[PDB]
Amino acid sequence: IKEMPQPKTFGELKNLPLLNTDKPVQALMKIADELGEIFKFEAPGRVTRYLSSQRLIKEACDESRFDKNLSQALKFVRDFAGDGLATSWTHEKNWKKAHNILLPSFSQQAMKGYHAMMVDIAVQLVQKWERLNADEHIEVPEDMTRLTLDTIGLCGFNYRFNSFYRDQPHPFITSMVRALDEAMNKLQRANPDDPAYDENKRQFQEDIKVMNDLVDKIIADRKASGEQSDDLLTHMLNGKDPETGEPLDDENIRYQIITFLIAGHETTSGLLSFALYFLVKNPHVLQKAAEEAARVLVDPVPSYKQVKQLKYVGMVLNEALRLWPTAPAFSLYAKEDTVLGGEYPLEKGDELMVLIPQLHRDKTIWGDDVEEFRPERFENPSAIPQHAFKPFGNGQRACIGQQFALHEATLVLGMMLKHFDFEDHTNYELDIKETLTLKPEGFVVKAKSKKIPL
Numbered sequence: 001i002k003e004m005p006q007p008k009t010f011g012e013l014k015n016l017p018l019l020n021t022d023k024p025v026q027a028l029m030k031i032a033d034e035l036g037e038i039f040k041f042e043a044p045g046r047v048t049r050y051l052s053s054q055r056l057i058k059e060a061c062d063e064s065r066f067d068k069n070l071s072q073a074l075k076f077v078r079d080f081a082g083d084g085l086a087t088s089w090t091h092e093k094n095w096k097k098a099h100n101i102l103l104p105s106f107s108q109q110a111m112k113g114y115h116a117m118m119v120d121i122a123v124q125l126v127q128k129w130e131r132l133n134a135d136e137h138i139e140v141p142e143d144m145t146r147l148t149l150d151t152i153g154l155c156g157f158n159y160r161f162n163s164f165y166r167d168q169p170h171p172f173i174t175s176m177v178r179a180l181d182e183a184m185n186k187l188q189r190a191n192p193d194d195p196a197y198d199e200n201k202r203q204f205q206e207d208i209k210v211m212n213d214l215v216d217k218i219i220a221d222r223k224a225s226g227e228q229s230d231d232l233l234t235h236m237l238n239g240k241d242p243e244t245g246e247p248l249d250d251e252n253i254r255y256q257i258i259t260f261l262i263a264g265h266e267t268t269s270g271l272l273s274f275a276l277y278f279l280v281k282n283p284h285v286l287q288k289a290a291e292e293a294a295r296v297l298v299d300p301v302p303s304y305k306q307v308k309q310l311k312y313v314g315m316v317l318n319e320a321l322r323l324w325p326t327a328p329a330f331s332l333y334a335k336e337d338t339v340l341g342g343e344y345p346l347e348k349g350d351e352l353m354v355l356i357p358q359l360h361r362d363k364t365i366w367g368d369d370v371e372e373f374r375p376e377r378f379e380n381p382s383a384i385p386q387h388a389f390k391p392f393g394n395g396q397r398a399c400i401g402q403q404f405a406l407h408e409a410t411l412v413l414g415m416m417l418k419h420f421d422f423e424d425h426t427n428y429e430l431d432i433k434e435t436l437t438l439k440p441e442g443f444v445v446k447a448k449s450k451k452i453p454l
């Protein structure tokens, strides 16, 4: 039995002030570099343990011993995502019911049905960049967020946010972004009942109303028309859980759409932004990926089967997820008393945080070149030990969107590499903004068209 390390304390505030920063996940990564594979973190009225090693995370991923916990972050998001899949407890009826109904709509086979709608938004991105004037630049995370939000809107509930027609986002997106900001800001808000925050609370309730009104109206419109589309909303309206025999109620369908819209906006855009960042910083890797894109994408419009053929592009995306997993942590609780790693006794209910960027820097797994961007380290994935690579979470509570995110990102990155050469014209210094997720901030490039028609 070992006593685990703990970072510096602030008297009665314990460790809490360490997270009073715009970059708290990056702060925790530096603490993990100093303290190692596990450290205790205390705040008034709570304790958790941050895990960074594959040795310990492999055990945390044992669903017989640990289940998904709602982090305080997810509990605050639950005020607008409700009992949607990501903010529900495993033991809530609506978790397994929505899981059973939606799993077949998110399978690799299901991606064939979304492919045409994904191509529609991907072509809008390519056309935007084709239409820039000489020496104009691209705002990378901005355009990747326009694309990923519009893709899940069109695939989620056949709704066009038309983000490529705008400087200022659709009002729904303004409200969702401000609600996500309020949720994450509340993690570091001392005295949340101070009248100073009456405006924040009023604004939060207004933003919840904007999101619910749009989504509830589209659900009501669809039910009335009886229209059948190639979309998640159609699948959720037609679906019955084989176990309970029940469909989802309209309120839960709304929470699933809001959940999907948060994911589209926050996750996939970050992955594409980090992937392009790593490609422009590693020109030999960019060349190899561009050669594959040219070899495989032989038609004006990529096909579903061509996207599956972009093997090296898939490896580039996995290597971007390794270094900067855009959903950077998940939380677990001990189902029963148990000993972690032969060393750390835990009581039933004790919480763990998995610090995914640190797991992905475990030199015992990846070797001494762990900070290098080397997609080829994914060439022989059977050689990777269990639970070493966790950008999509764990077990039955893993990302339902994984096939959707990777299909969209592979299609889009493949088209970007087919159609343009890229220049890091500012020699951009990586600056990672933290919202629900991690994204480059201020990342800009210049594209030079290869003048290949669509």
Ligand code: HEM
Pocket (backbone or CB within 6 Å): 068, 085, 086, 087, 099, 152, 259, 260, 261, 263, 264, 267, 268, 271, 321, 325, 326, 327, 329, 330, 331, 391, 392, 393, 394, 396, 397, 398, 399, 400, 401, 402, 404, 405
């Ligand atoms: C349109 C894209 C996406 C959608 C619709 C989506 C949707 C979801 C949903 C519904 C869940 C909850 C699953 C459940 O517990 O039953 C989830 C979990 C998760 N997703 Fe995704 N996701 C997407 C993209 C991504 C991407 C690109 C990443 C990472 C780069 C990501 C990382 C995760 C992680 C880490 C979890 C587990 C969270 C936890 O354990 O607390 N997601 N996603």
Ligand SMILES: CCCCCCCN1CCC[C@H]1C(=O)N[C@@H](Cc1ccccc1)C(=O)O
Pocket (backbone or CB within 6 Å): 019, 024, 025, 048, 070, 071, 072, 073, 074, 187, 188, 327, 328, 329, 330, 331, 353, 436, 437
């Ligand atoms: C998709 C990613 C969602 C979760 C990412 C977590 C993102 N947090 C943002 C701050 C650090 C990180 C985290 O470790 N927070 C924990 C612990 C915690 C609870 C209360 C206040 C501060 C921290 C939590 O939210 O419970």
Ligand SMILES: C=Cc1ccccc1
Pocket (backbone or CB within 6 Å): 077, 081, 086, 087, 258, 259, 260, 262, 263, 327
């Ligand atoms: C709605 C919140 C959420 C959280 C983690 C992954 C995907 C969605």
Ligand SMILES: [Cl-]
Pocket (backbone or CB within 6 Å): 009, 010, 011, 012
């Ligand atoms: Cl102290």
